[PDB]
Amino acid sequence: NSNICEVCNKWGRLFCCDTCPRSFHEHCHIPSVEANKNPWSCIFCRIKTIQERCPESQSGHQESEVLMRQMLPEEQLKCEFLLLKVYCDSKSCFFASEPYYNREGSQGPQKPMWLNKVKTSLNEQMYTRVEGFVQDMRLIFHNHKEFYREDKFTRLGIQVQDIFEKNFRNIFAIQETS
Ligand SMILES: [Zn+2]
Numbered sequence: 607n608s609n610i611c612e613v614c615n616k617w618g619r620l621f622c623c624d625t626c627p628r629s630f631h632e633h634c635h636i637p638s639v640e641a642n643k644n645p646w647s648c649i650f651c652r653i654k655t656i657q658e659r660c661p662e663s664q665s666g667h668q669e670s671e672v673l674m675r676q677m678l679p680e681e682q683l684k685c686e687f688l689l690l691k692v693y694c695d696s697k698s699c700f701f702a703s704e705p706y707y708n709r710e711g712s713q714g715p716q717k718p719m720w721l722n723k724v725k726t727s728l729n730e731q732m733y734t735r736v737e738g739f740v741q742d743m744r745l746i747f748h749n750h751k752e753f754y755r756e757d758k759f760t761r762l763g764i765q766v767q768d769i770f771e772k773n774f775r776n777i778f779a780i781q782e783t784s
């Protein structure tokens with residue numbers, strides 16, 4: 607197995623996947639690495655199994671249909687993986703914890719949102735459809751863009767949203783378009 611966490615790229619107290627060479631900090635993996643279970647399979651492996659069991663699940667889908675899906679176990683998993691793929695980028699640090707807003711010429715968002723809040727919401731089964739999860743994720747980046755206005759820091763929101771959107775299109779097999 608790898609000797610660094612797949613998500614944050616640091617060493618430490620790592621749990622190793624049994625079916626692939628990735629490793630994780632306990633709370634870096636989503637869901638948090640499970641207490642027992644030998645063997646243990648990571649979320650990457652669990653997602654690959656879904657695909658392998660239903661190869662047609664990789665055919666193109668419309669985003670509008672994906673968003674209306676109820677959060678049954680497979681969609682829960684897919685949203686957990688999508689969240690993890692965002693944490694995998696180091697620029698996620700900016701959006702992880704609860705933000706605060708005191709900048710001359712700007713007013714904070716009406717509905718603040720952050721990664722750790724989304725993480726808690728998934729853990730607590732608060733989303734009933736994929737749409738809930740995707741709306742809160744997109745709100746993170748939209749709040750950022752609106753607040754930071756012409757400051758060049760706005761670009762961090764564009765960058766991490768792009769990671770989100772690419773991974774959303776891949777994990778939910780969104781039909782490719784120009
Ligand atoms: Zn880690």
Ligand SMILES: [Zn+2]
Pocket residue numbers: 623624625626627628647648649650651
């Ligand atoms: Zn694995």
Ligand SMILES: [Zn+2]
Pocket residue numbers: 659660661662
């Ligand atoms: Zn099948």
